[PDB]
Symmetry: D2
Subunit: 116 residues, 4 copies
């Protein structure tokens, strides 16, 4: 499990459940190509996005669909989504956890990177 | 103005207005003594807490009354208050801004220390 | 000034100075078109990005070049840049401040939307 | 495990290891009484602070010794420690996770509260 996404709700103090997540990888032609996607679970985690074989070196963008999340909760938030862009695996395979902490007008994102 | 406090509300996307802020200085017996206090303005700021003359090196605690802030908005919060504890040193730059960004179950605080 | 950007450095406890900031507006074909850009000042602020007349409702992206900021400080960062994407609506208040607080492996961004 | 503390280092993108943590509980006389303490592990977590039996209703303060952490890393930080104060268990037992995300001049703290 080379890449995991974890999302928390700062208004309720709980995992953010059912959050849509789309990962893209920057292509040779320079455009964003769809790479993987999924929804967070009851713990606020999204496992199984990818495998060590597929998750090669490159520039990746993890889009977290914060606006859908807030609206399904009846709330009208500021941001369209949270976007986290980073180069991955360029000195060998790492494990990456992308955490995000959501409020309606604010979010925080943190990367925890450990050597597999 | 050597010490300024600034508070933002992450749920409404606004300055946090009328938030009570109490500052204490650690005394030689180790208790916290009231030092200054105020309420944040319409822009979420509290100016005029002390003067250069009074703000000597020492250990200070800034308590930001978040719980009453969230309750006046009808929103259920987690913390009793947010608390920022630090040593003021004449070495480093000269003005201290303590900024805090509040959510009901989360906050962050940052020291902006400048000349 | 309807749109202002403000950036703080959580490692040094200072405004983030000379940070490049590019703003884009989503076009009808769905591409991002350059809209405005600048570098943050000595107080970590970027004023003068647009005018009321130009800043119409639409979807905007603000890209904050954190990677080059950390590299000029000799500090190894994680993200390529920080990216804030939002719809500007004439309904809500009238001035938008996008604030960001940067660490090498973490950032937060907050929209302060006021009258 | 009713109360767990998790600490991350935002400069390195990794768990904050060996962080001292002291919990206090506000006493009848109104002073802070020592309640429990421990150090974070290699994952940045501190388990076993307390038990459901001991962790009764009250006002608790979790002090995270951020200044020692930064200094053992050769860094001179702003804050003495991070202090997280909250009422616990006042409508029954909950599980509480207190997370903190540390930078030398800044920290974030989040509470995740779930029903046991």
């Amino acid at each position: 499990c080379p890449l995991m996404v974890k999302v928390l709700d700062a208004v309720r103090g709980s995992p953010a459940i059912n959050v849509a997540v789309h990962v893209f990888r920057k292509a040779a032609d320079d455009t964003w190509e769809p790479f993987a996607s999924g929804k967070t679970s009851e713990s606020g985690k999204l496992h199984g996005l990818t495998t060590e074989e597929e998750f090669v070196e490159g520039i990746y963008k993890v889009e977290i669909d914060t606006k859908s999340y807030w609206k399904a909760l009846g709330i009208s938030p500021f941001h369209e989504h949270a976007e986290v862009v980073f180069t991955a695996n360029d000195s060998g395979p790492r494990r990456y956890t992308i955490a995000a902490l959501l409020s309606p007008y604010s979010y925080s994102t943190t990367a925890v990177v450990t050597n597999p």
